């Protein structure tokens, strides 16, 4: 990084003004004579004792253990921004009742208890309790600051950064508030930062910054703002989980301090104070709470969970077809091949280079014959060219972002001079969606999906490589008001384009660089332009875990690193790490050497093929975890503390993670490693090494030996993992194949697991209830398949070809019972050394109820 291109808190006038306020007696007080209580909210006026500015507090109890606090000016010169399109519904409220009242305080009960809110009038404070347990305080350190709008102080008004002058017509309008979390020492979230999963105290340095920015050659372990911003913070202790969602789309700085107690301060450039307090008590309760507000992860089409091969750039159609054929000649599975910016006509999006891609439909038909897909890049910057139809239409319809003088903003990006469509305008989004029809996007087909890059937006000659603060958007809002949702709107409009081009039948696949709260509803995200170095391989875990905690489950990092050339050992370890992360794509910068996996020496090719085969065989498990994310809002990739909340030794772990509740992964992430230290948690828990079947009792730190082909993965006792053991060239080839169930017995001789199946790519699971959700359960010598959702029916040829039971003794006989058939006897194999029992060919449909009895 060139740090001089990005503002520190002292270089952002509003951050410097807010941060200069230190703990003390707040000048704000509530005027209790103005208190009004209704069934949905409590409202009361607040006054600043010195300036006499009046604000309005709207306090609400909400269903599912949440509280909403909104503060705005009582009589503003002009309305303040309130974030649209992020919340999926108007949250259901819970009634507040006055249970206590004096001259300086009001005690409110939420519904019939146990939650209570204490409003103190002077100084203004809110305390949130469950019975007699204080959960959180608001304005405890008196850091609330609401800069009222003055008539349209260094840098309070006009402000320059480098050569860029922000005219700042509305002057200082920042808002900020502090929260106290007694009993909390560990906080997480607020992505995107290339930093530790457990957030650091910011007292002696910079606050964490949330401002979507394109940071060239970003560095590690620092609080600089990266490409996306999710203003959600989680707090974990042995006793409880809490969440804070600060709904503001302006540049935001977050200060974290410790005392046991953690204090959090949010400071935003503009808008209102709008904050949701998610009171848990469990971390799963917090996930459900946040999902009720911003929605859940969109169910990926199955192919998007396979392996993606990309680079900047494949040369032409012949290169794409040679890469396709390379995977098949080297028996390596791959679902998608990607086309970066050189596929277009001079970076005019929605076009094709006429020499390199003259016949895109023919290229797409060949990929379709191999049951593969293609992804093409489409960025939100439009070349200024009178011969380019997209530019002419957007210019003619006034759909570009404007400068204050009313002219269309022009900046520098990949096509040279370019304009920026105003994605905050709902008509611009409708136009964009419609551009993805097969009639408008000539050369596209149903196996062509999309990648949105540079959607911060990236502006090469702009301040901090983004758009001017005082550019003007739909409704007269300034760029400063909306910045962090610009990328989300690009992502949303593209996803809607792919749904609509199919007549609403096909599920979309869109990868986005920039994001905000709610982006989980539109597709995948990735950690941007990382580097081919061991420390960047390591940091992919805390970065994708920080995203998973705040709802963005479909995350990944570029396999091999984007910048520079990885050594073969690093490329192998990166394939192994990526094979166990939700979004799995190899990508590389323009000046790097080619790194298709068959270009390496045989030892490296073989370790990469092994990692690809592991991933493809686990697709039924991955698909089921994503279905659970889509239905419940639970993360796919999880920190160990989510599964072991009372194990304080797991609270900062970031070199290991879990997939659901069933697999624990510790990828090798150091050159020349001959072993790894694996922490296997759980009192009375057992773990099975999935390669050797060796059983290990928790809690312990195991030193596991490793070779180049090793991927340290353990299955938790008590779980059933489904796999497709017949690895084929792509997921479409496999999606109707038989399943093998891997049953890992707990010390009590029990196990359970689910399996979701559908057609792999449409909305039929929701519009026609065409799916299966099975529950597999093992207890007392019997394995049973039953329906976990009887509404789902699916005609499928999928059958159970095998059952592998770890921790089982040798039976004398194995009997299968299924409705509509006579009783069956199965053959079996048993290894007495490992206590692994293999049941041969059950032969039963996955859609049927059945039971297998041992002895």
């Amino acid at each position: 990084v060139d740090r001089s291109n990005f503002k520190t808190c002292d270089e952002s006038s509003f951050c410097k003004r807010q941060r200069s306020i230190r703990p003390g007696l707040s000048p704000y007080r509530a005027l209790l004579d103005t208190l009004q209580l209704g069934p949905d909210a409590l409202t009361v006026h607040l006054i600043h004792e010195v300036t006499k500015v009046l604000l309005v507090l709207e306090l609400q109890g909400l269903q599912k253990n949440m509280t909403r606090i909104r503060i705005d000016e009582l009589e503003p010169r002009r309305p303040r921004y309130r974030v649209p399109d992020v919340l999926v519904a108007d949250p259901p409220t819970a009634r507040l009742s006055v249970s206590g009242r004096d001259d300086n305080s009001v005690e409110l009960t939420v519904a019939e208890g146990p939650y209570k809110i204490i409003l103190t009038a002077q100084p203004f404070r809110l305390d949130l309790l469950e019975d007699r347990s204080l959960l959180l305080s608001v304005n405890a350190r008196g850091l609330m600051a609401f800069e009222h709008q003055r008539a349209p102080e260094p840098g309070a008004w006009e402000e320059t950064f480098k050569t860029h002058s922000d005219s700042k017509p509305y002057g200082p309008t920042s808002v900020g508030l502090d929260f106290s979390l007694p009993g909390m020492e560990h906080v997480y979230g607020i992505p995107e930062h290339a930093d530790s999963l457990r957030l650091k105290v910011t007292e002696g340095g910079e606050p964490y910054r949330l401002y979507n920015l394109d940071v060239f050659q970003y560095e590690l372990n620092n609080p600089m703002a990266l490409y996306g911003s999710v203003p959600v913070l989680l707090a974990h202790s042995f006793h409880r989980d809490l969440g804070i969602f600060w709904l503001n789309a302006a540049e935001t700085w977050v200060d974290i301090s410790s005392n046991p107690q953690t204090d959090i301060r949010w400071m935003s450039e503009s808008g209102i104070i709008d904050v949701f307090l998610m009171l848990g008590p469990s971390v799963f309760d917090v996930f459900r709470q946040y999902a009720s507000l911003t929605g859940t992860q969109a169910l990926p089409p199955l192919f998007s969970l396979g392996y993606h091969q990309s680079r900047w750039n494949y040369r032409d159609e012949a290169d794409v077809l040679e890469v396709d054929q390379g995977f098949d000649d080297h028996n390596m599975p791959c679902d998608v091949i990607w086309l970066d910016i050189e596929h277009a006509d001079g970076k005019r999006y929605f076009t094709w280079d006429p020499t390199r891609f003259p016949q895109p439909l023919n290229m797409l038909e060949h990929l379709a014959s191999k049951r593969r897909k293609l992804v093409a890049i489409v960025d939100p910057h439009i070349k200024v060219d009178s011969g380019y139809r997209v530019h002419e239409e957007l210019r003619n319809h006034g759909l570009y972002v404007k400068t204050r003088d009313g002219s269309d903003y022009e900046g520098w990006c990949w096509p040279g001079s370019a304009s920026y469509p105003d994605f905050t305008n709902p008509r611009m989004r409708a136009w964009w969606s419609n551009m993805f029809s097969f009639d408008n996007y000539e050369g596209s087909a149903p196996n062509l999906y999309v990648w949105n890059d540079m959607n911060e937006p990236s502006v090469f000659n702009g301040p901090e490589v983004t758009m001017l603060k005082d550019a003007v958007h739909y409704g007269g809002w300034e760029h400063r008001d909306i910045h962090n949702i610009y990328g989300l709107y690009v992502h949303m409009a593209t996803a809607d384009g792919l749904i609509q081009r199919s007549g609403g039948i096909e599920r979309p696949f869109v990868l986005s660089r920039a994001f905000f709260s709610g982006s989980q509803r539109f597709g995948a995200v990735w950690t941007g332009d990382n580097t081919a170095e061991w420390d960047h391989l390591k940091i992919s875990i805390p970065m994708c875990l920080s995203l998973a905690l705040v709802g963005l489950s479909f995350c990944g990092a570029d396999v091999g690193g984007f910048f520079k050339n990885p050594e073969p050992e690093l490329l192998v370890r990166w394939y192994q790490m990526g094979a166990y992360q939700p979004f799995f794509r190899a990508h590389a910068h323009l000046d790097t050497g080619r790194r298709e996996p068959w270009l390496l020496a045989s030892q490296y090719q073989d370790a990469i093929r092994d990692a690809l085969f592991q991933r493809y065989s686990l697709l039924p498990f991955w698909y089921t975890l994503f279905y659970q994310a889509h239905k419940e809002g639970f993360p796919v990739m999880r920190p160990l503390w989510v599964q072991y909340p009372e194990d304080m030794s797991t609270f900062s772990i970031e070199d290991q993670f879990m997939l659901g509740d069933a697999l624990l992964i510790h990828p090798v992430s150091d050159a020349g490693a001959h072993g790894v230290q694996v922490y296997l948690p759980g009192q009375e828990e057992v773990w099975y090494d999935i390669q050797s079947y060796q059983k290990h009792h928790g809690p312990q730190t195991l030193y596991l030996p490793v070779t180049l082909s090793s991927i340290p993965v353990f299955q938790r006792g008590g779980t059933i993992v489904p796999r497709w053991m017949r690895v084929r060239r792509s997921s479409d080839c496999m999606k109707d194949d038989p399943i093998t169930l891997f049953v890992a017995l707990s010390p009590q001789g029990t196990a359970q697991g689910e399996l979701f199946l559908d057609d792999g790519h449409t909305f039929n699971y929701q519009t026609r209830h065409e799916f299966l959700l099975r529950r597999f359960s093992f207890s007392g010598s019997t394995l049973v398949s039953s329906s976990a959702d009887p509404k789902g029916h699916l005609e499928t040829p999928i059958w159970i070809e095998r059952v592998v039971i770890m921790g089982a003794g040798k039976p004398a006989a194995v009997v299968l019972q299924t409705k509509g058939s006579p009783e069956s006897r199965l053959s079996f194999q048993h290894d007495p050394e490992t206590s692994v029992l293999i049941l041969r060919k059950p032969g039963v449909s996955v859609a049927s109820d059945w039971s297998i009895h041992l002895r």
Partner: protein, 83 residues
Amino acid sequence: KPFTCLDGTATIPFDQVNDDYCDCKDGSDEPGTAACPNGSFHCTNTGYKPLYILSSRVNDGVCDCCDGTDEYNSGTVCENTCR
């Protein structure tokens, strides 16, 4: 009467030959299906050069043999392109 794997690893009845479950470590009991991870399917390609393909390419929905015999129960109907 039984079948012995070409590698000598097991002896199974003929009913476990092409039964869509892998019983031989060499894949020799499943020459006609996709059940074995290391098996091979023979493209007879009558009137042209014969080819062997991976067993994972039998009924994968992709036309691998020029005679189309690898796709017999997948839904993909392959045309004869041997010439």
